[PDB]
Symmetry: D4
Subunit: 121 residues, 8 copies
């Protein structure tokens, strides 16, 4: 089963992070979310109820990203993957990638972040 | 067998979508199409008949994308994958990715979409 | 006097526009704001009070862009230029550029928009 | 008077050009159009009739670019500037930039093209 | 064994292609080449003789791409993969991706091309 | 006299800024420097002594940007323009643009900054 | 186990390389580092000690890249993978990609480089 | 008279430069050329003889850029401006911008270069 639903480069201004001044100031978080969902039925019926609404998915992601400051990207991604797997039975698996393109690290780079994959069991 | 024929970032203005005002206004759809085709014969003969014409493939994709408004990306991609697998025996598998970089979702992101993979059986 | 203060590519999701379905759905608006301000005093004192706070400027722009739906970019830019010239005596002139990269126009382009320049008299 | 209405990076597939094989094959043309129009009235009334409709402007540009193959970019831009200045009394001046990012010139570059400015008298 | 040597986005002006006017005019070809080579020995000795010289690899690719006009990308990639596998015993496998970002296809896209993978046996 | 020497998009990690947490954490500063220098003599002699060494210019800019934390971009740019005009008699004028692409401002934009122009008298 | 910690497009000015003039002049090296680490515990506790600090990882990478000139990318990547696997028990595997976008190779391309994957045993 | 003919981002591999190791290794040079030419006649006749052939212009630029190593960008641009003004009577003025995006300067930037403007008298 290789079909996916994706939301790519979602950007939220948040205050998450280990460092306190980091929580003070905040930064932009970029989030990719990929859902392993079987799409041939909705592909068959062209009815949205047969698939997972990507619109609703985005509001869920935003709630968490624009929610209470937490320490780790690992934790942020974990709560998004839960929220999504618990809300949508059709989702076999949830992949969550969170990037900080501009964290408090002196140097030159494009970004740093984590990615997790969480089967819905 | 890892050889492919691809068409990347095809852009069409269409009126597909769940929301009606969305069908009214329309938007740009970006489409990626990847075909699992065995290329060493055409690689051997340098004759186009031994491979799948990417030119013809594009007109097929455009017919569908610039065709009658449907509700779901899942459905649009499904009809492209059929059209292609039915027209070309050489295609072992068809992968179809459709992105809406600017759908009616209030927020900041790069795109949302689906991707499907359909073996030609 | 060639010194400026600028805010570039500000992006807001708004519902402005002539077409009603356009007001329904909304879209992303990109805004550039350039202020002709004489900077050598703040350049001398390194005191923020001698210059125009770009932070405050952004909230003003956002209020308008993320405010009540209006018909024209010409009108949106006009209210930003007023707001700014009226709030900040130091601003000799205000330039306001508003772009719709994805308006309801069927075709392929990077953007459409207006730009105005308004002296503070 | 520094206010403008602009349409940026419009892309059309056309067959214009000196070389015949060039007319045969065709290519993508990128067009920028900038109109010197006084916007403070429409800025005042928020009524579209007080300004030049950028939507209508685009169809004019497309008619010409996706029209009969001509030899020179100079000529293509000339007919767009006429069409526009003749259709819209409010336009004081029309600037037309046409780029061929991929003309029949062996080498490595981003583009080649012309730009003209035509007052509406 | 997951180590690779890669050359990415090589660009050559060539005249390859099915259409004759296409052979007449020519275009830019972008080539990606990825070699499955075991790198821990050269990783150990820091001696170039223990690895495949990417410099030499590029001249090989250029010879073919900037060589006699052929009909198909499938064929071009085939001759590069041979040339490379035959010249370098250390290469376990050769992957060759050739893209035409601007072929004679009327429409809007980022590119079309093929990709092949050829084990060195 | 329209000739210039330019250094574009120089990036430095610095701790400048009004906000203290901003001084704590730091950020990337992008700097553009444009020098109005008459180049036809060095254009004539191909001798570097007849022109301003852009290499040396960069070290000057870096000293300041990667120097003691100051409050304002206005002040940072002022010290670069001095340093340069005082060090190089040939420079008729110095233009200094400093951008913060990611300052502590909650929202979506490309950057904020100032630009100054300082004749060497 | 598909979770990763990544650092993407890190850029360092270094003098590594086979050619001596290359060691003389130096160039920019871009480095991607991907760590296969199991993140659900830190995902559970939101405590940094349960995961690998990406900040510390970057300083390690920089030490090596901005360290003594070596001949091969293969060797540079090898020392980064060691350094990391030896320092962090939690890392199951380390992937290191090093690109030279502008090496001493006459031609037009985006980059050349190597990528290695090293399990921590 | 504001009409121009332009060639943008031409890229050549050359060995120009002050430093000798720089002449040894070489680098990519990016060149912009803008010609102030009156285009309304060719705009009138659609005959190429009434305007300056941008194709021929490019070969001239390449001859110089891919010609004998010289010390300064100032000198390179000077010889291009001459060559062009001397060859084409119609050119009122020639603007030449030459950028080194990756010169031997340790640091992080987008480019350094010069720009000159030379009237054809
Ligand atoms: N794996 C992992 N490593 C980290 N290292 C440092 C920080 C801090 O929040 C800051 O120092 C940088 O944002 N966060 C993380 C994190 O969230 N995950
Ligand atoms: N998986 C999936 N989810 C969707 N959610 C909303 C919409 C609607 O057309 C619009 O609200 C957004 O385009 N379409 C889809 C869709 O086509 N697929
Ligand atoms: N100058 C100018 N021309 C316009 N033409 C059409 C529209 C409408 O809102 C829509 O049709 C497109 O967004 N708006 C404008 C506008 O705001 N300004
Ligand atoms: N100023 C100017 N110069 C030109 N040189 C060559 C060509 C031809 O159509 C082709 O050889 C390249 O597209 N066209 C032009 C042109 O349209 N304008
Ligand atoms: N798989 C494959 N399909 C193709 N379709 C058309 C063309 C022609 O050369 C031109 O019409 C387009 O470049 N070439 C190819 C090709 O090389 N490969
Ligand atoms: N003109 C001008 N306005 C500013 N507003 C806020 C800040 C502060 O350092 C921070 O709040 C944002 O970086 N700095 C400036 C500044 O340097 N210049
Ligand atoms: N696999 C591999 N091939 C190479 N070929 C040439 C060079 C030299 O340092 C220079 O000629 C180019 O940077 N280095 C390498 C290298 O580091 N790895
Ligand atoms: N204005 C100007 N300044 C320069 N500074 C250093 C170098 C040298 O060739 C090298 O050190 C850097 O490419 N060239 C120049 C140059 O060509 N122009």
């Amino acid at each position: 089963m290789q079909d996916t639903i994706f939301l790519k480069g979602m950007r939220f201004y948040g205050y998450h992070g280990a460092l306190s001044a980091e929580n003070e100031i905040g930064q932009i978080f970029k989030v990719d979310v990929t859902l392993k969902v079987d799409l041939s039925e909705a592909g068959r019926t062209d009815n949205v109820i047969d698939t997972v609404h990507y619109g609703e998915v985005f509001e869920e992601v935003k709630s968490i990203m624009e929610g209470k400051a937490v320490n780790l990207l690992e934790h942020l991604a974990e709560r998004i993957a839960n929220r999504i797997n618990s809300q949508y039975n059709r989702v076999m698996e949830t992949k969550v990638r969170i990037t900080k393109e501009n964290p408090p690290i002196p140097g030159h780079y494009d970004g740093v972040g984590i990615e997790i994959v969480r089967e819905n069991k």
